[PDB]
Amino acid sequence: QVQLRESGPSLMKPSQTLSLTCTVSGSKSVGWVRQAPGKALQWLGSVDTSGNTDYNPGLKSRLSITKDNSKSRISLTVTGMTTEDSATYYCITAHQKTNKKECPEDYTYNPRCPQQYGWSDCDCMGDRFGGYCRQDGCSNYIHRSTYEWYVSAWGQGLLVTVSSASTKGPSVFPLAPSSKSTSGGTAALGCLVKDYFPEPVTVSWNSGALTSGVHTFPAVLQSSGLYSLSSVVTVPSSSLGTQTYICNVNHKPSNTKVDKRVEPKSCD
Amino acid sequence: YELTQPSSVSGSLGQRVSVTCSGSSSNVGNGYVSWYQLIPGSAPRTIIYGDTSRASGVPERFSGSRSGNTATLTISSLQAEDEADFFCASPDDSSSNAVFGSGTTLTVLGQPKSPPSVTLFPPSSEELQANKATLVCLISDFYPGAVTVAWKADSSPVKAGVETTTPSKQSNNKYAASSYLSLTPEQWKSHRSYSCQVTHEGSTVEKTVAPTECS
């Protein structure tokens, strides 16, 4: 059970260098794949247990990957970041293996048999015939792909935004239910997360203890260049004013966490 | 280099669909294609490896095949929770140089219809004290995931100041969306009401708030 955790900046300026880290826990190769919004997955590179590194040939000059076994990390460096490089960067582990042409067990490569007798599918001759060629000892090489690769574990991904605009933490405002906005025994209350940059923002309710009907909506990009979203949760109408309801807004890009209490709408 | 996939495929509940993945002898022809499922909001999920081998937890109705330089992912008995972007991938002339496909979006049709639940929030006291006003119209629990939002100031349409999100799936396979109307606190208070109209499958739900309505 391998767990992969990406860490690094959430915001780059144009032409800055992106340095990411992946911390591997549990126990091939460890590498990086990215996906820009609305675009296809793009393999970047990987480093195997022996220290060998490989890179997307179209991006190799910009990439660099290193490892540390004592720290159980790998890194990723990406030079000359542009808006084209804004993407979610996933740390991965991959199964890798190149299979040479091998004969099955109890068989040995013997080119004399097909060379001299013309037998088919007979590159290998059973060892039980002790170097002699018998057609009932023929065999092809082990049937298998020459190259094996696939992603065995995916990290959760780190969103990286390239922009000249600077980080901004969010302003959190309450979406308080009114006496007319309820839904009988339940009611919708939420928080408006306003004017932050870059993405992402996550929102829980009561430190995760409240999950029923929770939904965080996609963010809107205002003309100011700042994002806004809303999170809503459904709540017992009889509890409005008795139970405390707090939306925990986390904005990792600015190392900001806001716990906003949502109190019943009041006529002060 | 990128493997070629169809842009999208769709099927109704219980139906069968297949996604193709075309490459060349140096990658797909090598005979070790992998498939991945990406559900918006979750990390990518490995589904198939080695052309036909299923990852742990993948049911049998997810089948992988290959003929020459074209691999195929067949998904039978379609269920709503299958909706996702599917990508193929393969080694390319090497067991460490990997290539991905362009991706294919899967839509599962025929899910239970559901009208939208609409909640309209007026500007909060805190936002007004900061000299800004935002009406928040939250739309949830509807299928199909298509709605149109229109705003009213008193009884007349409002065109300026509106931002609406494209619908996305909730944790219960139904769709949700949000719309915002930006105002100055002055014009919030200078009119008797504001409304959010949500239209879904020909039927409309309208919610209204008034500056005079405290509590």
Author numbering:
A (entry chain H): 1 to 27, 32 to 82, 82A, 82B, 82C, 83 to 269
B (entry chain L): 2 to 9, 11 to 27, 27A, 27B, 28 to 95, 95A, 95B, 96 to 106, ...
What does the paper say about this structure?
Crystal structures for Fab NC-Cow1 were determined alone (2.1 Å) and in complex with the BG505 SOSIP. As in other bovine Fabs, the ultralong CDR H3 folds into an extended β-ribbon stalk supporting the disulfide-bonded knob domain. The knob domain begins with a conserved CPED motif (CPDG in the germline) containing a type I β-turn around PEDY, followed by three very short, antiparallel β strands (D6-D8, D23-D25, and D37-D38) with two intervening loops of 14 and 11 residues. Loop 1 forms a single turn of helix, while loop 2 has two small helical turns. The knob has three disulfide bonds with 1-4, 2-5, and 3-6 connectivity (D2-D23, D12-D32, and D21-D37). The knob distal tip also contains several Tyr and Arg residues. The knob distal end extends about 35 to 40 Å from the tips of the other CDR loops. Superposition of the Fabs or even of the CDR H3 stalks does not necessarily superimpose the knob domains, as the knobs can adopt different dispositions with respect to the stalk and Fab core.
Here, by x-ray crystallography, cryo–electron microscopy, and site-directed mutagenesis, we structurally and functionally elucidate the mode of binding of a potent bnAb (NC-Cow1) elicited in cows by immunization with the HIV envelope (Env) trimer BG505 SOSIP. The exceptionally long (60 residues) third complementarity-determining region of the heavy chain (CDR H3) of NC-Cow1 forms a mini domain (knob) on an extended stalk that navigates through the dense glycan shield on Env to target a small footprint on the gp120 CD4 receptor binding site with no contact of the other CDRs to the rest of the Env trimer. The HIV-1 envelope (Env) protein is a heavily glycosylated trimer consisting of heterodimeric gp120 and gp41. The most broadly neutralizing bnAb isolated from these sera, NC-Cow1, had 72% neutralization breadth on a 117-virus panel, with a half-maximal inhibitory concentration (IC50) of 0.028 μg/ml.
